[PDB]
Write an enzyme that holds these catalytic residues in place. Sequence first.
Site, PDB file in Angstrom:
ATOM      1  N   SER A   1      -1.839   0.609  -5.380  1.00 34.43           N
ATOM      2  CA  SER A   1      -2.391   1.832  -4.794  1.00 34.43           C
ATOM      3  C   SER A   1      -3.675   2.288  -5.480  1.00 34.43           C
ATOM      4  CB  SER A   1      -1.348   2.960  -4.908  1.00 34.43           C
ATOM      5  OG  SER A   1      -1.850   4.176  -4.329  1.00 34.43           O
TER       6      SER A   1
ATOM      7  N   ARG B   1      -9.029  13.034   4.850  1.00 29.98           N
ATOM      8  CA  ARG B   1      -8.704  11.628   4.688  1.00 29.98           C
ATOM      9  C   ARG B   1      -9.961  10.732   4.642  1.00 29.98           C
ATOM     10  NH1 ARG B   1      -5.673   7.483   2.716  1.00 29.98           N
ATOM     11  NH2 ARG B   1      -5.271   5.810   4.231  1.00 29.98           N
TER      12      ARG B   1
ATOM     13  N   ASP C   1       0.838  -1.192   0.000  1.00 25.19           N
ATOM     14  CA  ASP C   1       0.000   0.000   0.000  1.00 25.19           C
ATOM     15  C   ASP C   1       0.879   1.250   0.000  1.00 25.19           C
ATOM     16  OD1 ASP C   1      -2.740   1.260   0.657  1.00 25.19           O
ATOM     17  OD2 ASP C   1      -1.452   2.007   2.285  1.00 25.19           O
ATOM     18  N   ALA C   2       0.411   2.333  -0.617  1.00 28.03           N
ATOM     19  CA  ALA C   2       1.179   3.581  -0.608  1.00 28.03           C
ATOM     20  C   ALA C   2       0.726   4.568   0.481  1.00 28.03           C
ATOM     21  CB  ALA C   2       1.167   4.231  -1.978  1.00 28.03           C
ATOM     22  N   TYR C   3      -0.502   5.082   0.358  1.00 28.22           N
ATOM     23  CA  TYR C   3      -0.977   6.204   1.167  1.00 28.22           C
ATOM     24  C   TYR C   3      -1.378   5.707   2.554  1.00 28.22           C
ATOM     25  CZ  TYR C   3      -0.629   8.923  -3.067  1.00 28.22           C
ATOM     26  OH  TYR C   3      -0.142   9.578  -4.188  1.00 28.22           O
TER      27      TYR C   3
END
Lengths: 225, 226
Positions: free
Chosen positions: B119, B42, B11-13
């Site tokens: 992502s 968010r 995962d990135a974020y």
Amino acid sequence: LVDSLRACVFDAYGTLLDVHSAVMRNADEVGASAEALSMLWRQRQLEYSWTRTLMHQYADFWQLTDEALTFALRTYHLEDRKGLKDRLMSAYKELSAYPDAAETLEKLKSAGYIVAILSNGNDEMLQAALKASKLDRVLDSCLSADDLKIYKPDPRIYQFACDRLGVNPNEVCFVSSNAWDLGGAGKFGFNTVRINRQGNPPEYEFAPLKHQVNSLSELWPLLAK
Amino acid sequence: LVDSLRACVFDAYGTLLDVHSAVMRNADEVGASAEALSMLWRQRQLEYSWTRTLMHQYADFWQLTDEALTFALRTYHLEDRKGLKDRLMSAYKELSAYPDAAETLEKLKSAGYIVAILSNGNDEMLQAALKASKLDRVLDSCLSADDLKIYKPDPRIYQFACDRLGVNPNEVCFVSSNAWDLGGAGKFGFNTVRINRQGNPPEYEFAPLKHQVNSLSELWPLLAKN
Ligand SMILES: [Cl-]
Ligand SMILES: [Cl-]
């Protein structure tokens, strides 16, 4: 087409039923985190409804309400999670209705609209809340996502309402305070009216509203037949 | 977790990139709502990704990030939303990496794993963040929701990773801080590892984790090969 409305279809949780009231009624027992807890509880309940549908692991709305509440209480490290949890879930079972709900549903039912609820809530929790708030006697139909095992805003839930009520999308006035739900109903093709109580900003603009009002009682001038 | 693993998929974020840094670095400009603003931005970004896939109205992650920020700024009735929006979107385009991210991905790449990102972020926003943080050089592949126009945790996105990377689900170690993403990945069949930095409560328990650690650096003892 030109004079089309046959059905007023309402969201339950957030529109007819006040989701803030489960914690509000118990705020002193919760302590100063009550508002933050209440917001987290609501966001996780909805998160779970959406993500579980996407990943094909449905569980009913009461179960998600329970999981979300447990998660929120744990997050805030509360004292007496257990007694607190029992009280908050009981309060949720009989969530307070908004003060104008009963009267405005009565008025719409008298103008000869089919008056229905379309809700994520499973029958048990929904019927408990609608009975306690006297809203059940003023409904033609109460339709649950739990019959489909699929949550809003999947279009099949709005299609279920059409099929059950024997109406086309453009014959439905769909009433909700939840912008995501108005987004899904509008995209699907219902005529949507937002109850925007606090003047929240717009969202989901690709599915414009037919109207916006600030209380259920403002629906009656609008929908007077 | 026994190593017949061929790929570490990240995962990135929230996992490699710190979603909090966009507001934190501009907190003085935002004023005392900064943290509540950051949380709403968010939450809505993610909400938009889930509900838009459910109702079949895809738009890309940058657009959703923008819409979520605009919504959060208006909610807080902020002065100079125009200037703030530009500043906060630029900061997002180059989100800070977590401190152990670059080094741990290099160790994993040295152990001979395929090291990939999977992502929601579209290439343009994600590539900018990856370049700014020098994470570019420690990656074999960067896979986007934008290729399929379908967001996590829909199983088609995890399947896309299997397809592009030439691996079976059980040859993947899937790493995320996002519980919903671990839920989706785990239900799909990847071996899941949560990065739980603050010890948040467990969620999505129908899809058990293979492991949980508090830092990306702890993935090293978990995955190092003979
Ligand atoms: Cl309200
Ligand atoms: Cl964190």
